[PDB]
Amino acid sequence: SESTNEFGIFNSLWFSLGAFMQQGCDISPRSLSGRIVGGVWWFFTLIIISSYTANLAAFLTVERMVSPIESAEDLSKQTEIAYGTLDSGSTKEFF
Amino acid sequence: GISIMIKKPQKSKPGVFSFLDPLAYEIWMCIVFAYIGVSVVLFLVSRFSPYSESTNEFGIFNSLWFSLGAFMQQGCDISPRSLSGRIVGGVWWFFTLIIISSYTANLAAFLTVERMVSPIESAEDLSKQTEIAYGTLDSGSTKEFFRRSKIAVFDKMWTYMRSAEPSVFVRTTAEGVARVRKSKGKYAYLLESTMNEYIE
Amino acid sequence: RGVQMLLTTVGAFAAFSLMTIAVGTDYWLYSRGVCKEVMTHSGLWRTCCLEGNFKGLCKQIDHFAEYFLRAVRASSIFPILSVILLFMGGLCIAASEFYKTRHNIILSAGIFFVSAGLSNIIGIIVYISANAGNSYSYGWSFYFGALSFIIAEMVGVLAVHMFIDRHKQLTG
Amino acid sequence: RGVQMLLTTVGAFAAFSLMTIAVGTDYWLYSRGVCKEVMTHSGLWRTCCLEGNFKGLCKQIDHFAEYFLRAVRASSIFPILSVILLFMGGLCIAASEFYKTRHNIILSAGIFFVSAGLSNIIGIIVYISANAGNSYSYGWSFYFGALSFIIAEMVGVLAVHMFIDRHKQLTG
Amino acid sequence: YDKGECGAKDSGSKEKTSALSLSNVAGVFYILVGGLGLAMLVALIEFCYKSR
Amino acid sequence: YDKGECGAKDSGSKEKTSALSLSNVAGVFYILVGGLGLAMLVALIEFCYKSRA
Ligand SMILES: N[C@@H](CCC(=O)O)C(=O)O
Ligand SMILES: N[C@@H](CCC(=O)O)C(=O)O
User: Fold this and answer.
1) What's the DSSP call for residue E50?
2) Alpha-helical runs (H) found in chain A
3) Which numbered atom of ligand 2 lies nearest the CA of B191?
């Protein structure tokens, strides 16, 4: 008698994907454990999406370039930015 | 060199459910009752006789299942047949439409205010900020220097140091540090950088 | 199957009792306050002071365009309505012990219970909208009222399930 | 036909091997540290040093409301239970060479496989949260865990499908 | 001018937001419950029309 | 130099950048998992009913 419903594994992946996007899902669990499972995933997506849109909105409102380095320690860890004193200037002898 | 010293800003550890923080406890509670009521009314009106109750699928449990998915804006498998039921549907739809938008807007605002915090930086604007207080050691050379130097920003610093009471002055490094440690956020201190570099 | 009468007869009296107790007790709110500040407890009608030398001193509540809204809170008539309607609902099934075979005496019980619940909901919303205008928190009456509403709903629903069954079986 | 028994048992075996290796290897995280700063690699139990004179040195990890959550990471119970339940499922389905006709083996092992997989989602979430309580990147054990989970999510569907078909054929 | 004080004129310290109160949305609930109350009435009047 | 004994600072990668941490939404995932955890028992009681009809 098994498989009294459309919910093969393939169709289950399809349904759950359409449920994630807020997209048209025709079939229905019609049954308690399935309906229970359906609910929470909806709430999960609702929060996720709302968070994303909010944060991007904040991101576009204020910008900050961030300086790449600040310290002599960074200058000891140097990637590629070369550096040097003035020549003939006594700081060179000091170094 | 002389240096300014401040308390660490306390680290903003998240709360386990802080995602709820936009919406306040009472609203989260009161949504539940409305969901119940809507489901119950949908049930009752669906199964009152059409003039015979076998004529529609809208039993109590199906009525509870419709409303949850409708609240999520997930659509549904079935739709109420009578005009009376359609009224209920439209009402619940508008209700959710307001809530979800309000939630998103508030959360965005909450993050937005943060970014532009702009915390004290270089602290020379302690000549311009006034909500945050700063101390200096008694008899130390600084206590002459701010009287004895006369550069405009340091003029207004010395005016502050003159005028502010309970005074900016302190007898010892130990209790000045204690004053910063207890007077977290609101208080600051002036000291020799070599001492800060030892302490911190 | 038949027995549902024994169950549905139960809950309405309990919900009524809880609702009247909730209306009838001076413990809706914990707050700062006064009884002519110190930590204080209040109900809908009156205020009594604790946490101090005056402990046990009391006074009646401060009763005092949108102006006309104040009357609804000041009466709190919605709670009273919900209580009275719940009484009427229970009296429906008490009546339907006699005058049998009419059936339609049963029908209104659920309607009364639903409407009483809707009233309770409005009452809560009004009360919060008034009071929220300080580390406050709710007294037990609030939860008793909520629970009363929940039972009134469930009992109404299953009573309607009985009214669905008992008349239908005559109709084939 | 049939050999899906071999495929499903192989899948369970492989996931079990990967999971036990993952629990048993010092390859969860690369980070800076000292086995009391240098590049350092983490087991879930112990902190071990590379890239220096102490290369190959190890020390026991520093384990020290969320007050009670601390024990959740410290016990790492959910990782262990995932292995235990995958072991239960595998060793049960391994018995299906005898004690036949009841088929309880397949259903119970299916539920074991699914719950075993679910457990590691919690384990991962817990660990990734706790470590925030920079410069990081994940070691191979993290991916051996992910792969084990992926295979666990695969194998149970095929086993349930075999149970269904081998039971359903009584309809014809 | 030496007796000036209130740099709060310039918002010298920054407020922080708090959650919306129920009062800021209360309107929608009245609308909802009123709608449901109306929604019941149709069924009774329909049944009385269908009473013959 | 022996006496200095603190030094954890944002390096290699930095917290301050912008993105939401996993911790900032974590609880929802617990809610999800618990939800799925519940639905097993409903089917198990459905068997325990039907298995002796
Ligand atoms: N002012 C320096 C020259 C600049 C330098 O030393 O870099 C001197 O007196 O020698
Ligand atoms: N020891 C420093 C104290 C500096 C100060 O606190 O003003 C001095 O020689 O004056």
Assistant:
1) T
2) 9-21, 32-61, 72-76, 90-94
3) 6
